[PDB]
């Protein structure tokens, strides 16, 4: 449905969702197979990234306000939603005041504190069928995947959750209610 | 290359600039939030 | 030049074969793109797209140059173009006698004339590749 993004979601990701989806052919009236699907590809980055910080020697923290203010800082960078430039721009920073690996294709997240890239894929499928179709491709480099499910199971490589367990019982839920929707529109 | 706006780009930039510059370098905590505070009042300018 | 030798002008006709030739000796063999993907590591490294280092060659180079230029206060812009002239190969025709080699080929104007050809040895030491050819 083109109303499916429109009506539910605020309006800074409407933009968001507007942007470089403009490049090939289609357009928000063709398809409902990937125009509203890359729109959450930005709310679990902003889901993730919000009320997660850093502290000054180096631990993490769950905190309130969200506007860092001098001692503490974001823990997550939106790679997802910009330039194909300014993606790189991002992933290349990291990589050369950390010595690590720089990935093939494109991740869409970074976490300061574990240093580890995030290549974020939830689908219908459940967990094996699209754990391992990434994971025997993106392999070698060590791409952080986390997979969840359109219900709630769960399953991480090593199931080695970084995130603490009340945001991600928030964030099944923000796919739990999304997922009754594509049955009634 | 990019279809993005220049003054989008530019703060783009700045804000990663000024984050790896401190995070993982040699620039102060005040400044960080020095600089993010004038890319969102460009930010607000429109 | 300055560690070449010269021997003596032998005056005759010069016969000159107009052929495609190297005109950048020290051409650290590689393509355009090669050189770009150098020369942004060397002298952009934050601002590298998402292609890398593919070979052994673009490797020691980057690593190298990063070494020799590290630290000279200088407009990026000139190392950037230095190093597109100095990496890729150039060709071009001209009408050549004797030694074809690059090193040869950048002293044509010394070396021969209509009639007459100065015996000259450029600084350095030939390829192994020349010397077999």
Known sequence: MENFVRTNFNPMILERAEKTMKEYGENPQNEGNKFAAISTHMEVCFMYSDFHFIDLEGNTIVKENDDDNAMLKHRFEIIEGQERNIAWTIVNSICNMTENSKPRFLPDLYDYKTNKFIEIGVTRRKVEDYYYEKASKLKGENVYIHIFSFDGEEMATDDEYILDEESRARIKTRLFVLRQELATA | ?46 | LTHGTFGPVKFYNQVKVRKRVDINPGHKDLTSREAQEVIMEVVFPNEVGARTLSSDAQLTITKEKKEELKNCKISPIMVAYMLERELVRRTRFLPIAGATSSTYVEVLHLTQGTCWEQQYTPGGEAENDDLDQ
């Open chain 2, 1 to 46: 290359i990019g279809m993005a706006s220049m003054l989008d780009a530019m703060l783009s930039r700045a804000r990663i600039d000024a984050r790896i510059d401190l995070e993982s370098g040699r620039i102060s905590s005040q400044d960080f939030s020095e600089i993010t505070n004038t890319c969102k009042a460009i930010e607000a300018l429109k």
